[PDB]
Design an enzyme around this catalytic site. Sequence first.
Site, PDB file in Angstrom:
ATOM      1  N   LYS A 164     -13.573  -7.232  -0.915  1.00 16.40           N
ATOM      2  CA  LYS A 164     -12.398  -7.250  -1.659  1.00 16.40           C
ATOM      3  C   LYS A 164     -11.594  -8.616  -1.318  1.00 16.40           C
ATOM      4  N   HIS A 179      14.389   5.611   9.446  1.00 16.04           N
ATOM      5  CA  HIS A 179      13.923   4.110   8.851  1.00 16.04           C
ATOM      6  C   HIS A 179      12.175   4.508   8.447  1.00 16.04           C
ATOM      7  N   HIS A 215      -3.433   9.070   7.603  1.00 13.17           N
ATOM      8  CA  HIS A 215      -4.078   7.844   7.454  1.00 13.17           C
ATOM      9  C   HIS A 215      -4.425   7.730   5.786  1.00 13.17           C
ATOM     10  N   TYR A 241      -3.459   4.248   3.145  1.00  9.57           N
ATOM     11  CA  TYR A 241      -4.388   3.908   1.960  1.00  9.57           C
ATOM     12  C   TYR A 241      -3.787   4.178   0.788  1.00  9.57           C
ATOM     13  N   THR A 295     -13.214  -3.175   2.875  1.00  8.64           N
ATOM     14  CA  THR A 295     -12.022  -4.231   2.774  1.00  8.64           C
ATOM     15  C   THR A 295     -12.322  -5.596   2.894  1.00  8.64           C
ATOM     16  N   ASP A 335       1.812   6.503 -24.672  1.00 14.62           N
ATOM     17  CA  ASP A 335       2.501   7.048 -23.750  1.00 14.62           C
ATOM     18  C   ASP A 335       1.765   7.563 -22.763  1.00 14.62           C
ATOM     19  N   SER A 372       6.713  16.128  -5.924  1.00 13.00           N
ATOM     20  CA  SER A 372       6.495  15.037  -6.918  1.00 13.00           C
ATOM     21  C   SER A 372       5.143  14.143  -6.779  1.00 13.00           C
ATOM     22  N   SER A 373       4.914  13.877  -5.522  1.00 10.61           N
ATOM     23  CA  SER A 373       3.756  13.081  -5.370  1.00 10.61           C
ATOM     24  C   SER A 373       2.375  13.712  -6.129  1.00 10.61           C
ATOM     25  N   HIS A 423      -8.247   8.207  14.944  1.00 11.51           N
ATOM     26  CA  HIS A 423      -7.963   7.016  15.640  1.00 11.51           C
ATOM     27  C   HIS A 423      -6.694   7.035  16.066  1.00 11.51           C
ATOM     28  N   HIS A 424      -5.824   7.864  15.369  1.00  9.61           N
ATOM     29  CA  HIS A 424      -4.433   8.044  15.767  1.00  9.61           C
ATOM     30  C   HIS A 424      -4.164   8.775  17.196  1.00  9.61           C
ATOM     31  N   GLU A 451      -2.735   8.537   3.746  1.00 11.69           N
ATOM     32  CA  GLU A 451      -1.257   8.031   3.207  1.00 11.69           C
ATOM     33  C   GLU A 451      -1.383   6.445   3.269  1.00 11.69           C
ATOM     34  N   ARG A 465       6.839   1.878  22.371  1.00 11.39           N
ATOM     35  CA  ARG A 465       7.658   2.045  21.007  1.00 11.39           C
ATOM     36  C   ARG A 465       8.811   3.200  21.354  1.00 11.39           C
ATOM     37  N   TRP A 523       8.940   9.689  12.846  1.00 13.12           N
ATOM     38  CA  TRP A 523       8.468  10.185  11.481  1.00 13.12           C
ATOM     39  C   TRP A 523       7.174  11.053  11.582  1.00 13.12           C
ATOM     40  N   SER A 544      -5.441  -8.154  -7.713  1.00 14.14           N
ATOM     41  CA  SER A 544      -6.273  -8.373  -8.566  1.00 14.14           C
ATOM     42  C   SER A 544      -5.854  -8.728 -10.087  1.00 14.14           C
TER      43      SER A 544
HETATM   44  C1  HEA Z   1      -0.799   0.368   4.679  1.00 14.46           C
HETATM   45  C2  HEA Z   1      -0.645   0.544   5.918  1.00 14.46           C
HETATM   46  C3  HEA Z   1      -1.967   0.132   6.757  1.00 14.46           C
HETATM   47  C4  HEA Z   1      -3.315  -0.205   6.444  1.00 14.46           C
HETATM   48  C5  HEA Z   1      -4.024  -1.021   5.427  1.00 14.46           C
HETATM   49  C6  HEA Z   1      -3.893  -0.157   7.962  1.00 14.46           C
HETATM   50  C7  HEA Z   1      -5.246  -0.533   8.103  1.00 14.46           C
HETATM   51  C8  HEA Z   1      -5.927  -0.177   9.321  1.00 14.46           C
HETATM   52  N1  HEA Z   1      -5.438   0.479  10.307  1.00 14.46           N
HETATM   53 FE1  HEA Z   1      -3.468   0.839  10.721  1.00 14.46          FE
HETATM   54  N2  HEA Z   1      -1.958   2.011  11.066  1.00 14.46           N
HETATM   55  C9  HEA Z   1      -0.781   1.901  10.092  1.00 14.46           C
HETATM   56  C10 HEA Z   1      -0.811   1.558   8.677  1.00 14.46           C
HETATM   57  C11 HEA Z   1      -1.906   0.772   8.208  1.00 14.46           C
HETATM   58  N3  HEA Z   1      -3.078   0.698   8.860  1.00 14.46           N
HETATM   59  C12 HEA Z   1       0.357   2.513  10.607  1.00 14.46           C
HETATM   60  C13 HEA Z   1       1.592   2.715   9.748  1.00 14.46           C
HETATM   61  C14 HEA Z   1       0.175   3.120  11.986  1.00 14.46           C
HETATM   62  C15 HEA Z   1       0.955   3.538  12.717  1.00 14.46           C
HETATM   63  C16 HEA Z   1       1.440   5.011  12.436  1.00 14.46           C
HETATM   64  C17 HEA Z   1       2.075   5.557  13.723  1.00 14.46           C
HETATM   65  O1  HEA Z   1       1.331   5.774  14.701  1.00 14.46           O
HETATM   66  O2  HEA Z   1       3.156   6.240  13.743  1.00 14.46           O
HETATM   67  C18 HEA Z   1      -1.329   2.592  12.010  1.00 14.46           C
HETATM   68  C19 HEA Z   1      -2.029   2.886  13.028  1.00 14.46           C
HETATM   69  C20 HEA Z   1      -3.031   2.467  13.396  1.00 14.46           C
HETATM   70  C21 HEA Z   1      -3.871   2.686  14.638  1.00 14.46           C
HETATM   71  C22 HEA Z   1      -3.190   3.276  15.848  1.00 14.46           C
HETATM   72  C23 HEA Z   1      -3.040   2.551  17.040  1.00 14.46           C
HETATM   73  C24 HEA Z   1      -2.437   3.370  18.099  1.00 14.46           C
HETATM   74  O3  HEA Z   1      -1.786   4.531  17.513  1.00 14.46           O
HETATM   75  O4  HEA Z   1      -2.238   2.870  19.396  1.00 14.46           O
HETATM   76  C25 HEA Z   1      -5.190   2.092  14.354  1.00 14.46           C
HETATM   77  C26 HEA Z   1      -6.266   2.120  15.524  1.00 14.46           C
HETATM   78  O5  HEA Z   1      -7.364   2.667  14.851  1.00 14.46           O
HETATM   79  C27 HEA Z   1      -5.310   1.644  13.242  1.00 14.46           C
HETATM   80  C28 HEA Z   1      -6.041   1.102  12.704  1.00 14.46           C
HETATM   81  C29 HEA Z   1      -6.205   0.552  11.464  1.00 14.46           C
HETATM   82  C30 HEA Z   1      -7.703  -0.129  10.766  1.00 14.46           C
HETATM   83  C31 HEA Z   1      -8.833  -0.246  11.814  1.00 14.46           C
HETATM   84  C32 HEA Z   1      -7.352  -0.535   9.362  1.00 14.46           C
HETATM   85  C33 HEA Z   1      -8.268  -1.307   8.329  1.00 14.46           C
HETATM   86  O6  HEA Z   1      -8.016  -0.713   7.187  1.00 14.46           O
HETATM   87  C34 HEA Z   1      -7.858  -2.769   8.369  1.00 14.46           C
HETATM   88  C35 HEA Z   1      -9.084  -3.336   7.752  1.00 14.46           C
HETATM   89  C36 HEA Z   1      -8.746  -4.621   7.179  1.00 14.46           C
HETATM   90  C37 HEA Z   1      -9.653  -5.745   8.003  1.00 14.46           C
HETATM   91  C38 HEA Z   1     -10.761  -5.464   9.104  1.00 14.46           C
HETATM   92  C39 HEA Z   1      -9.177  -7.254   7.501  1.00 14.46           C
HETATM   93  C40 HEA Z   1      -9.809  -7.551   6.149  1.00 14.46           C
HETATM   94  C41 HEA Z   1     -11.350  -7.460   6.144  1.00 14.46           C
HETATM   95  C42 HEA Z   1     -12.186  -8.502   6.708  1.00 14.46           C
HETATM   96  C43 HEA Z   1     -11.242 -10.003   6.883  1.00 14.46           C
HETATM   97  C44 HEA Z   1     -13.582  -8.545   6.805  1.00 14.46           C
HETATM   98  C45 HEA Z   1     -13.975  -9.176   8.165  1.00 14.46           C
HETATM   99  C46 HEA Z   1     -13.388  -8.392   9.386  1.00 14.46           C
HETATM  100  C47 HEA Z   1     -14.266  -7.658  10.234  1.00 14.46           C
HETATM  101  C48 HEA Z   1     -15.648  -7.768   9.959  1.00 14.46           C
HETATM  102  C49 HEA Z   1     -13.607  -6.867  11.276  1.00 14.46           C
HETATM  103  N4  HEA Z   1      -4.046   1.851  12.506  1.00 14.46           N
HETATM  104  C1  HEA Z   2       7.027   0.370   4.595  1.00 12.14           C
HETATM  105  C2  HEA Z   2       7.860   0.921   5.388  1.00 12.14           C
HETATM  106  C3  HEA Z   2       8.769  -0.007   6.317  1.00 12.14           C
HETATM  107  C4  HEA Z   2       9.303  -1.257   6.071  1.00 12.14           C
HETATM  108  C5  HEA Z   2       9.567  -2.423   4.777  1.00 12.14           C
HETATM  109  C6  HEA Z   2       9.924  -1.787   7.337  1.00 12.14           C
HETATM  110  C7  HEA Z   2      10.561  -2.783   7.468  1.00 12.14           C
HETATM  111  C8  HEA Z   2      11.268  -3.106   8.577  1.00 12.14           C
HETATM  112  N1  HEA Z   2      11.090  -2.685   9.791  1.00 12.14           N
HETATM  113 FE1  HEA Z   2      10.101  -0.869  10.026  1.00 12.14          FE
HETATM  114  N2  HEA Z   2       9.034   0.746  10.714  1.00 12.14           N
HETATM  115  C9  HEA Z   2       8.366   1.335   9.768  1.00 12.14           C
HETATM  116  C10 HEA Z   2       8.400   1.203   7.966  1.00 12.14           C
HETATM  117  C11 HEA Z   2       8.649   0.147   7.784  1.00 12.14           C
HETATM  118  N3  HEA Z   2       9.411  -0.794   8.205  1.00 12.14           N
HETATM  119  C12 HEA Z   2       7.836   2.779  10.316  1.00 12.14           C
HETATM  120  C13 HEA Z   2       6.952   3.567   9.415  1.00 12.14           C
HETATM  121  C14 HEA Z   2       8.092   2.709  11.692  1.00 12.14           C
HETATM  122  C15 HEA Z   2       7.942   3.547  12.681  1.00 12.14           C
HETATM  123  C16 HEA Z   2       8.910   4.838  12.810  1.00 12.14           C
HETATM  124  C17 HEA Z   2       8.856   5.458  14.150  1.00 12.14           C
HETATM  125  O1  HEA Z   2       8.628   4.719  15.198  1.00 12.14           O
HETATM  126  O2  HEA Z   2       9.139   6.662  14.062  1.00 12.14           O
HETATM  127  C18 HEA Z   2       8.939   1.573  11.747  1.00 12.14           C
HETATM  128  C19 HEA Z   2       9.382   1.107  12.825  1.00 12.14           C
HETATM  129  C20 HEA Z   2      10.291  -0.095  12.839  1.00 12.14           C
HETATM  130  C21 HEA Z   2      10.813  -0.314  14.394  1.00 12.14           C
HETATM  131  C22 HEA Z   2      10.571   0.340  15.599  1.00 12.14           C
HETATM  132  C23 HEA Z   2      11.789   1.144  16.102  1.00 12.14           C
HETATM  133  C24 HEA Z   2      11.378   1.848  17.291  1.00 12.14           C
HETATM  134  O3  HEA Z   2      10.761   3.144  16.895  1.00 12.14           O
HETATM  135  O4  HEA Z   2      11.381   1.418  18.386  1.00 12.14           O
HETATM  136  C25 HEA Z   2      11.257  -1.463  14.093  1.00 12.14           C
HETATM  137  C26 HEA Z   2      12.253  -2.595  14.818  1.00 12.14           C
HETATM  138  O5  HEA Z   2      11.710  -3.230  15.786  1.00 12.14           O
HETATM  139  C27 HEA Z   2      11.210  -1.801  12.618  1.00 12.14           C
HETATM  140  C28 HEA Z   2      11.770  -3.008  12.046  1.00 12.14           C
HETATM  141  C29 HEA Z   2      11.794  -3.588  10.914  1.00 12.14           C
HETATM  142  C30 HEA Z   2      12.369  -4.397  10.082  1.00 12.14           C
HETATM  143  C31 HEA Z   2      13.176  -5.424  11.114  1.00 12.14           C
HETATM  144  C32 HEA Z   2      12.040  -4.414   8.699  1.00 12.14           C
HETATM  145  C33 HEA Z   2      12.286  -5.282   7.621  1.00 12.14           C
HETATM  146  O6  HEA Z   2      13.707  -5.005   7.383  1.00 12.14           O
HETATM  147  C34 HEA Z   2      11.784  -6.875   7.692  1.00 12.14           C
HETATM  148  C35 HEA Z   2      12.217  -7.560   6.558  1.00 12.14           C
HETATM  149  C36 HEA Z   2      11.841  -7.127   5.385  1.00 12.14           C
HETATM  150  C37 HEA Z   2      12.808  -6.762   4.349  1.00 12.14           C
HETATM  151  C38 HEA Z   2      14.150  -6.706   4.474  1.00 12.14           C
HETATM  152  C39 HEA Z   2      12.193  -6.744   2.855  1.00 12.14           C
HETATM  153  C40 HEA Z   2      12.076  -5.186   2.729  1.00 12.14           C
HETATM  154  C41 HEA Z   2      12.298  -4.511   1.206  1.00 12.14           C
HETATM  155  C42 HEA Z   2      12.159  -3.531   0.805  1.00 12.14           C
HETATM  156  C43 HEA Z   2      11.440  -2.564   1.464  1.00 12.14           C
HETATM  157  C44 HEA Z   2      12.621  -3.272  -0.887  1.00 12.14           C
HETATM  158  C45 HEA Z   2      11.501  -3.631  -1.749  1.00 12.14           C
HETATM  159  C46 HEA Z   2      11.679  -2.862  -2.908  1.00 12.14           C
HETATM  160  C47 HEA Z   2      11.319  -3.488  -4.077  1.00 12.14           C
HETATM  161  C48 HEA Z   2      10.291  -4.873  -4.054  1.00 12.14           C
HETATM  162  C49 HEA Z   2      11.512  -2.952  -5.566  1.00 12.14           C
HETATM  163  N4  HEA Z   2      10.595  -1.006  12.038  1.00 12.14           N
HETATM  164  O1  LIG Z   3      -3.305   4.253  10.002  1.00 12.50           O
HETATM  165  O2  LIG Z   3      -4.308   3.296   9.910  1.00 12.50           O
HETATM  166 CU   LIG Z   4      -4.832   5.817  10.534  1.00 12.75          CU
END
Ligand code: HEA
Ligand code: HEA
Ligand SMILES: [O-][O-]
Ligand SMILES: [Cu+2]
Lengths: 47, 123, 121, 65, 49, 65, 99, 180, 91, 107, 459
Positions: K306, K60, K228, K232, K303, K90, K152-153, K277-278, K230, K428, K125, K243
Amino acid sequence: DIPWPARTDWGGHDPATPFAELMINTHSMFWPVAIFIYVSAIYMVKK
Amino acid sequence: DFPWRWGFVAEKPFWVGAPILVLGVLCLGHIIQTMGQIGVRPKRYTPEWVEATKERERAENTNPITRYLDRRRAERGPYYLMSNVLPYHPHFLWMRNSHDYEAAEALAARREKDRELAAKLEA
Amino acid sequence: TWTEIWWEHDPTPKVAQYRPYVCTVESGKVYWWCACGESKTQPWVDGHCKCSKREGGFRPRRWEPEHDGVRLFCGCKSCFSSPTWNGGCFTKWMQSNPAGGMLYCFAAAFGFGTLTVYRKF
Amino acid sequence: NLEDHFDLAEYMMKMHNPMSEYLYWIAGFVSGLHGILPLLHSNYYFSGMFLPRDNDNTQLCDDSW
Amino acid sequence: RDWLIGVMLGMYLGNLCVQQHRQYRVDMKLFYLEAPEHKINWVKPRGDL
Amino acid sequence: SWSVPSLGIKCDATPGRLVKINTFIQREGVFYGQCSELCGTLHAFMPIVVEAVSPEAFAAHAKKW
Amino acid sequence: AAVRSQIEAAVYKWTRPRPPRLGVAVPRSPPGTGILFHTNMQTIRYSLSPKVWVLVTGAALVGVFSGQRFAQTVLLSKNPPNPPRYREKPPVRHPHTPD
Amino acid sequence: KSYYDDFKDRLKPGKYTQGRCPQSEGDYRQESKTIGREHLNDDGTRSKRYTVKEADALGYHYHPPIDKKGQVYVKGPNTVIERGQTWIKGYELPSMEYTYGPKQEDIPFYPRVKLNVWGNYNLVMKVEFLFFYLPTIIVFGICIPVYTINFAQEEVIYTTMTVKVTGRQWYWVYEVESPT
Amino acid sequence: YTPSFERGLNPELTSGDYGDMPKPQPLIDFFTQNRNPWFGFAMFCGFNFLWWAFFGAWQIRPLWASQRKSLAEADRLYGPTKYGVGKKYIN
Amino acid sequence: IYEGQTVQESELIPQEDDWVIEETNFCLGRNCYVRFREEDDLARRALHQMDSQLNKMHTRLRDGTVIPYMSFHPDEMVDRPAPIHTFSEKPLLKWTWDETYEEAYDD
Amino acid sequence: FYILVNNNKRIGIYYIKLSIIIGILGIVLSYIIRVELYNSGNRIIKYDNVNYYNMVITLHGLLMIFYIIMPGLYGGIPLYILPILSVITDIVLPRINNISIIIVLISYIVVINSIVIEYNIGTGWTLYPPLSIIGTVIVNMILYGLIIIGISSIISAINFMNILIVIDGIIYVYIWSIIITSVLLIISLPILNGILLMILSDIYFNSIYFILNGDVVLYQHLFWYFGHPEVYILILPAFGIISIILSVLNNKIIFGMKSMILAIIMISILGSIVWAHHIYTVGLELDTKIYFNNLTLIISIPTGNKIYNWIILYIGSYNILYNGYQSLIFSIMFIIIFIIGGITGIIISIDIIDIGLHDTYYIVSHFHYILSIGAVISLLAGILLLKDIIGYYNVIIKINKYFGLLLFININIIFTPQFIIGFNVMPRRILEYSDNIIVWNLISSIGSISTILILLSIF
Ligand code: HEA
Ligand code: HEA
Ligand SMILES: [O-][O-]
Ligand SMILES: [Cu+2]
Ligand SMILES: CCCCCCCCCCCCCCCCCC(=O)OC[C@H](COP(=O)([O-])OCC(O)COP(=O)([O-])OC[C@@H](COC(=O)CCCCCCCCCCCCCCCCC)OC(=O)CCCCCCCCCCCCCCCCC)OC(=O)CCCCCCCCCCCCCCCCC
Ligand SMILES: CCCCCCCCCCCCCCCCCC(=O)OC[C@H](COP(=O)([O-])OCC(O)COP(=O)([O-])OC[C@@H](COC(=O)CCCCCCCCCCCCCCCCC)OC(=O)CCCCCCCCCCCCCCCCC)OC(=O)CCCCCCCCCCCCCCCCC
Ligand code: CUA
Ligand SMILES: [K+]
Ligand SMILES: [Mg+2]
Ligand SMILES: [Zn+2]
Ligand SMILES: [Zn+2]
């Protein structure tokens, strides 16, 4: 100690160490700031 | 330009259809997830097991700060707990009359032995 | 206050009512809304007001509902979402009676404060 | 040529054969099966059943069914 | 100027949680001192099964 | 990962690292936790149970067990 | 009612807006120029003048916090002292202790 | 009024599912025999021979378009001389009723308006400053708390007892000093 | 449901001949959507979900009554002692 | 920041006392899905699609100039749906400056 | 032809098509997870087949990240509009563009084939060793897929960077969004490849990096040094889309274009230096923890700028324009949803809060709100905006208020309860759990089945 049904436990619950209390209060300290950040921004999402 | 299903839905006011659809989809989801557990009655949700957990919590003084904070909040103002009103497990629909009679006999025997130990401890 | 203090080259309406008009409307029908506040068939153009006569920059405002139902319509003639109502009638009233505006706002805020505090506390 | 002006002209001009759409949906359906079929196969391989009965790994009441 | 209304609305709603947190800390200070829920010389080891 | 939420402890049990965690329990009870790092098939089946008792009780227990 | 109209007329007179101090470099409209646009132009939001906005916004702030005080003093109650903590006998055995 | 009724006649309901008869009743897969349609199938779609099997990009049916003088056919403008001046009349697209169907009447009025721009440079600059530095202040407000709590976890404490905990698949081993 | 004709704050501005155009109505009509039964069902539906969202459905309560009476008896007889208003809650 | 073009008061003075703002509708018209005729083949349906492009439409003002369909980005300038080859003639981004050279003028 | 086509716009369509196909497998796995977690017990997976659940969650995550959202937001919309936005005929590298999509498909086939043929086990994953290196051959197959995907990436990143050499117009914000993601890929991928090769060496070449006297924490550093960046690389293209949509639909010029651009650049630099932070719970040094916590909180500043610049784009827009278009609703919903995900990210950024919330479903809900809700909706909104240009039909989405409302409500029913169980606490990557966490897990499960049903109404 143990999870209980349908509990929010926002920020943590039932600490039994000084550090555990610290963790709960750190979350509680920042929570109002998070609400402010959300409310203040969302209120302006409109035409 | 649209099939019957969309012509029907799109004809109605949005705030007439939307609320009904939201509830309907949620109800259907629960129904689907209940079909595979019709009649399932785990023993750990019976009254006998429910009482035994209460005994364990009393002996271990479990979550004492949740119980203290609930009392303090309730004294101050209106405090509502979901755990108080709703079932905590989904098999409640089938376990109205379910019991574990073997646990009942064992639990009663242990309670009797505990009373004897308490009297001895009192001395 | 755009017409009042900022810009003097847009037509300025008269307030027919500081409250919206409630009307039942039907999908597939076009309605014409009075933008001058002088029509006697409010909220619609009567054929004799400024809008109907195309006088002084006033023109009827075309409107059409997507679905049948009861919709609120602007009486103050300045709502941002005109012809529909969004609360601008109350806002424009506060500009005209600022003392009254404070009373209502205090009362509304008082109720909101009590309820939110009572539930959270 | 006018026919070659638009990419995927038959589809954009609404003349394409429906089989192309059917294949796309079938391909997605097959992709979905890659999560369900191995689940059933693995369950049977290690248990002898294609799918479990809810809470059959725990103690059940006498009348449970 | 309107965005200020949002600041004030977000400051009111945030202050509600400040008050809850404030009362929470007062309650916590009284747990180990006065709360009958706090028990000592109570939990006994279960022992190996 | 050795996790006891009530004691505010979540330390990763990593091979090659002997991580030090200091604690001071304030109340008696039994604090339940679970492994917090995917560790294989039975990651969900190795819980962490810690029971805190009075110092006089702990001494008697340690002397007997 | 006489005092009501008096304060209403007193507030109104003081709040009447004065011409804005434009923070932009615009021309002066030619003299004698009337209404040139029409009502079908995209609606421009009706905005309160600064003084009126402060008055009503201030009334709202005074209202919400006075409402918070009303709820705290009348609707809600204070915690009574915690019950006395008396010595109580613990259970003789853990329910799971082997016999 | 109902605008669909205006162009109802043009839309004749269909007879075949997906707009084609069974291949047995008519073979739409074959290339059309009509003169000038050798690149099309019977149903009008482009033939595989034209697009795949004998695609010109692969060297089939080589026919250079440009002539000897390096010229290609170009259609001229609609020129109309008048008032001692040569004018070009632009091509206006057909009425949207012809292409879309609805009758072009009772169109709602959307006036010309120049772009909706934010004004008052000084005010805007201050807002942008706040858009950046209000978050910066909040971060700074968290910074000191973050340092303190981090320092608290990593504090040299006078511990008097040690419990060693080893994690194995799938159980937890505990080593504790035994009373002497 | 043959709604009434509300003249409004200025009755002279509603004194003209409407003809086919709709006449203004009381505000209760807007809230009831002209007493449309489906909108009433939809309104009741809106309350039903929101109650589920915040406090739970509370439609399971009649079914859970017997199993909430057993849970309450167990907590009182064997559970840790509850004090004051705490005795109202059972988990 | 951009705040519109600068206006001098002299440019706001009318040549007649009845001048008002021209009320020309900038709604292009009523549209829907492009509706192809069954009789038209693939080539003739392509012509139909090319004749339904909104970005080829404009509004003619009282003086004969036309304000075209405009967009912030060039994504809205290609035919819809996008053809295989779009910008054969390079789109020209016109920049303005005050520089001039004598060769362009004649006395 | 079909497979031979080099047209950049056709290839863009292929990327979206393949993302939906592979997405079906992704959603199915998600349904399996939520069904299992509906109560305590075994529901659809036997206790003797628990290894399958570990594989389900692993696949998943990997598929949704690398085979669905990344190919959709960085391969699909980019390959279709970027050369048009750049007023160029193109894409610079036609043949490379063709092979990139073919590579993605081939790596997908390898992964799914490994499900069918290999023993089904999982290691997350994040493929943490030593667990990843003591597994069966399915782990080897997954590694091959990732390495192939990496090829590919990187080549696609090279392709986009070359637009700077040929762009004939102005670099719009969206173009800046893709360029910076390309830079992030060029700098992060080579490190990932190295650590993946070391995983292979221990799996297949008798290497000893991840056995005693070798530090397993080493992998986590190199992995998350790509990990991380990734997240972003997956969000920045979404920001670029938001935008364009807001400016176009509201008929308002982007406000603070240069601040938007400089905010994207800033997020990238900061995102390249905050990876640990991970790794808060491993036991890093106090000063390291404080550095990473400090820099992680800084990312909110750019962030945040924006977000507020987007809000003013929607403010003040003409009322006459109909605002119920699905693309506009999705763009607005992104702001509302992203703030939730980001704020929770800042909460978890505090390491002491993180001790309690690491490896709990609070983290799940955090990154779902951003990806499963925010990124998905952004891709949908972008495709919807380009419906006329792309030309697809046979769906009822463009104006469907029911779909938007139902999706928003039900998606929140799934993940909002996962924030609650984070403090209860539910770890988890588990399938069985204590009976006192059923309520919230059940509510989220009801949300998952409902969302799937709403996906059928579009057709
Ligand atoms: C695209 C996906 C995405 C994005 C944008 C982010 C954004 C951020 N993530 Fe991430 N993060 C994940 C995807 C993402 N993350 C995933 C997938 C994991 C788990 C992976 C795994 O463990 O397997 C993860 C895990 C993860 C952890 C791990 C927690 C743990 O392992 O127990 C933490 C903690 O530092 C973290 C922090 C953040 C922070 C601080 C931001 C910042 O970018 C957020 C910034 C945005 C805001 C802050 C809000 C908008 C800003 C404002 C409204 C301004 C005013 C706000 C303030 C002044 C605070 N992320
Ligand atoms: C972007 C990536 C992505 C997306 C879309 C989702 C979508 C969803 N995920 Fe996600 N999920 C992950 C990334 C994602 N997840 C990752 C990275 C983990 C951690 C893996 C790990 O633990 O090792 C995770 C873990 C995770 C768990 C934890 C299982 C566990 O480890 O114990 C669960 C269930 O609770 C869950 C549920 C769901 C559900 C219910 C939806 C969605 O079904 C919710 C409903 C939304 C939709 C059905 C729309 C989705 C449609 C598309 C994605 C297609 C878009 C295409 C076009 C627009 C062209 N996810
Ligand atoms: O990963 O934030
Ligand atoms: Cu991170
Ligand atoms: C996330 C989901 C929800 C999303 C919702 C939101 C969506 C929003 C909108 C998104 C829009 C995105 C952009 C769209 C752009 C579309 C552009 C387009 O149309 O391009 C034109 C393009 C082609 O049109 P064309 O230009 O006329 O092409 C002419 C051909 O080139 C030449 O014509 P031809 O007839 O000569 O063609 C050759 C033909 C010749 O075909 C035939 O002869 C076919 C004969 C009939 C076969 C039928 C299948 C038989 C299956 C038997 C199975 C037996 C199982 C037995 C089991 C027994 C168990 C005991 O095919 C072949 O020879 C090769 C076919 C290869 C593909 C099919 C593969 C199937 C699966 C195979 C699995 C194998 C597994 C092996 C495992 C082995 C393990 C050891 O269109 C398509 O390809 C169709 C696209 C249709 C959908 C478009 C999007 C619509 C909007 C979205 C709807 C929702 C979709 C949701 C996903 C799917 C759910 C299921
Ligand atoms: C019974 C016992 C008790 C009795 C109690 C009795 C109490 C009696 C009280 C009586 C009070 C009387 C008050 C009379 C009104 C005075 C104010 C007024 O309306 O002006 C009078 C008067 C109005 O005359 P008028 O007849 O209406 O003539 C109007 C003309 O057309 C043209 O006039 P003009 O061209 O001269 O320009 C004037 C116009 C010019 O207006 C403008 O240029 C716009 C001004 C507003 C801009 C707001 C920008 C906000 C940007 C936010 C960006 C970030 C958002 C995102 C944040 C995310 C965070 C995570 O001014 C306004 O519109 C002012 C509007 C009101 C501003 C309110 C500011 C409140 C700030 C509150 C901060 C609270 C912090 C709490 C912290 C707590 C910590 C625990 O003004 C003048 O003639 C000019 C001189 C006076 C200027 C006053 C100061 C203005 C300050 C603006 C500050 C803006 C906020 C800055 C901080 C932002 C932080 C984010
Ligand atoms: Cu051990 Cu998980
Ligand atoms: K389960
Ligand atoms: Mg971990
Ligand atoms: Zn009128
Ligand atoms: Zn009004």
